[PDB]
Design a binder for this molecule. Sequence first.
Ligand code: LT9
Ligand code: LT9
Lengths: 304, 304
Amino acid sequence: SGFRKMAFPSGKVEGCMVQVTCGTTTLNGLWLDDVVYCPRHVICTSEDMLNPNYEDLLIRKSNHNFLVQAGNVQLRVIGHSMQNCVLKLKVDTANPKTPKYKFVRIQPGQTFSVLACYNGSPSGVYQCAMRPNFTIKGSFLNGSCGSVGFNIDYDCVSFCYMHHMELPTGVHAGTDLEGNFYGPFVDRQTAQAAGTDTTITVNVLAWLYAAVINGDRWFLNRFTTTLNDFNLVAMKYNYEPLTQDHVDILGPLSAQTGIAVLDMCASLKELLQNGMNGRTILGSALLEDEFTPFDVVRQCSGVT
Amino acid sequence: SGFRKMAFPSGKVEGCMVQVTCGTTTLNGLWLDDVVYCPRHVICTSEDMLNPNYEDLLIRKSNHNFLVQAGNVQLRVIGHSMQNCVLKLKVDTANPKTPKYKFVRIQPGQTFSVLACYNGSPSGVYQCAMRPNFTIKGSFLNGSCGSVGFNIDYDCVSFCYMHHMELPTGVHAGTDLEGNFYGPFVDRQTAQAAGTDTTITVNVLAWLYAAVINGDRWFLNRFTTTLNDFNLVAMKYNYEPLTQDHVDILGPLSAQTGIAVLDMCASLKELLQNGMNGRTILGSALLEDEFTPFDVVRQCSGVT
Ligand SMILES: Cc1ccncc1NC(=O)C1(c2cccc(Cl)c2)CC(=O)C1
Ligand SMILES: Cc1ccncc1NC(=O)C1(c2cccc(Cl)c2)CC(=O)C1
């Protein structure tokens, strides 16, 4: 009973958080095995961020300029390299708390947990999604850079995000763990605007299935629709077009509830056209799109 | 930038989760030092839950009947006692991962994180609040009993909740770590109804302050009100009466934003009377009441 925006337990990631300082700049790093990963803008001053030439700024840095502190102990830096927008600092000690891990580059619409950190110390954990415009709506302040996003499959942590910057609109941009930005963003203090923040339709449908499973059924109607008809409505409301791949992923939720995917689409169509009329679904007064079909199955089954 | 429903990092609590089995019943326990805490209904069968006499059911249980497994290793049970609605199982090994901890009994309106577990294994973490009717709106399935709620002050974990049951309405009831239920609930499979779920006014005001800090300012108006005038409106909308104690706790948010508490009350009054008119505040289409003033200060300052 009940349905909450749930994050993965963060212990495995907390054991990886370190502080990296280079000059006067301090941010977070991720220590896995004998490598510390962090945003390359750790080498920049505030003046440097306007138009940084990272290769040139890195020439003036040596291993001893990167101060890496794990809790209260100093790690010895024996190598450093830049991979895209991340720095990889080779340290002389493998992290004893390194979990089983993978680096994955996620797709827009996919959700993950973020362990927000400051000075190598965790402050909180929350769940969010890679928006279709490749931004994330997080909660990050100055010093949170290097905080990571991840998913967990039993014992394996799949790292998918490293926080780099806030856009002038207060939305967030970052990279995968190979240092490649999600979307078109660059690690420079230049105004970069985000595209249309469309709604992740397959996630809204999954959340409607979670609502039915939990007793919120008022929105179920006597209608059905087709993918093409549904998609005309989706376009009108800045919703992602629904494909047969999305219908397929909703199959287990359709099977569990006995509500055909296209019938749930017709319920969603009426909600788009008519609004909620002052009513709520799973305690929300808007259509939630940051639960994937996998998240709904996981939460509704009790996977650990 | 950004404001999210953030839970505390759960690592310190994950290191305390164990599985307790008694007969055919398995639930979660909390292992701190050489004691494992768990709901006393672990000794019950499904037949026993209709009208259990816990003292009598406990006479037929010995130390060896409580199977406690920490990850994949068995703990030796050398003592057992019942304190209110919890069992305390003395084990022969102190938990090496025991964090600095306290047991606190929270007040309605206070928020905390829950580490939902199944079979001693963490599945997720979410933030919630003790409702004014002493229920919590969680996400718990069969086997989640013994999952705990907590807050963290730097290195000290303050345990405040242990999950025991779901009401027939899908809301949740549990105890503090001394085994005393929050509210009037009893650990028995008898239909128990929850009282009025009123809105935590001081939390809604704190969340309005977080909204102003983050740029969502449309709801600020040219009005002010008094505590008594505000409270007539609060009563009409099933909001908790606001007291001078609540105004005092909002002082730092008032000081940071320059918006007097009673002016924020007048903005809240207009939102109650007029609704949001299809608009959102911090991505929500309703007034959020599960952030305390302390949570807002903490999140907006970056406390680790
Ligand atoms: C202030 C803040 C809040 C939330 N999330 C991140 C930041 N930091 C930034 O955005 C900064 C930055 C500026 C341009 C490019 C890049 Cl890569 C980084 C300005 C710094 O200091 C780093
Ligand atoms: C099924 C579920 C979902 C979420 N949270 C808890 C539960 N479990 C219960 O409520 C059960 C129960 C019943 C009456 C009293 C008490 Cl103390 C416990 C029925 C069990 O099995 C334990």
